[PDB]
Design a protein around this ligand. Structure first.
Ligand SMILES: NC(=O)c1ccc[n+]([C@@H]2O[C@H](CO)[C@@H](O)[C@H]2O)c1
Length: 189
């Protein structure tokens, strides 16, 4: 027999800011066995390593703002743990990686067994963004001056993507999105 324990199923949830990515990941995780979640936002660099543009906007919404080597190390640590998560006697451990900037990171371009992408239009995204507090906070004009233009850059970067993505309407309710993804996912596992 082919030894078990080495298989994993990795799900990517990306999408624009404030589109429900973290909540979706957590709702899926509550309904999937032996499932972990890694969040991209846990890997931002310290503000001293973050550059500022001509107009004084901090450059957070770009891969250079993230310690992606550290995030890879976290993925690898999950994989090591996953190999011991099922006692020997297939139950395939699940990882959900969720973050606003995943699908343009080339070292991970072959990791994704399923990929979802949450979308919300400009107006509602801006509204939702204004309800959240970041550290540091959004400066005046930050949405138009940085967040949205960087999101558009990301979407254009994804124009030549080498795997399939399922795009989701992030204006749908949390339960609606959970059920849609769960219905898809349980056919892929
Ligand atoms: N998590 C952070 O330290 C941080 C700092 C400044 C801005 N952000 C915003 O987080 C979003 C990703 O969820 C990006 O759009 C950043 O602007 C995060």
């Amino acid at each position: 027999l082919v030894p078990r324990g080495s298989k994993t199923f990795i799900i990517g949830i990306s999408g624009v800011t404030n589109s429900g990515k973290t909540t979706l990941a957590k709702n899926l995780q509550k309904h999937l066995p032996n499932c972990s979640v890694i969040s991209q936002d846990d890997f931002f660099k310290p503000e001293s390593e973050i550059e500022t543009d001509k107009n004084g906007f901090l450059q957070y919404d770009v891969l250079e703002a993230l310690n992606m080597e550290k995030m890879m190390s976290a993925i690898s640590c999950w994989m090591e743990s996953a190999r011991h998560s099922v006692v020997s006697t297939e139950e395939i451990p699940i990882l959900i990686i969720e973050g606003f900037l995943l699908f343009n990171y080339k070292p991970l371009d072959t990791i994704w067994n399923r990929s979802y992408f949450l979308t919300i239009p400009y107006e509602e995204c801006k509204r939702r963004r204004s309800t959240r507090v970041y550290q540091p906070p959004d400066s005046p004009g930050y949405f138009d001056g940085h967040v949205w233009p960087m999101y558009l850059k990301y979407r254009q970067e994804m124009q030549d993507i080498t795997w399939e993505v399922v795009y989701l309407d992030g204006t749908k309710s949390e339960e609606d999105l959970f059920l849609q993804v769960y219905e898809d996912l349980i056919q892929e596992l």
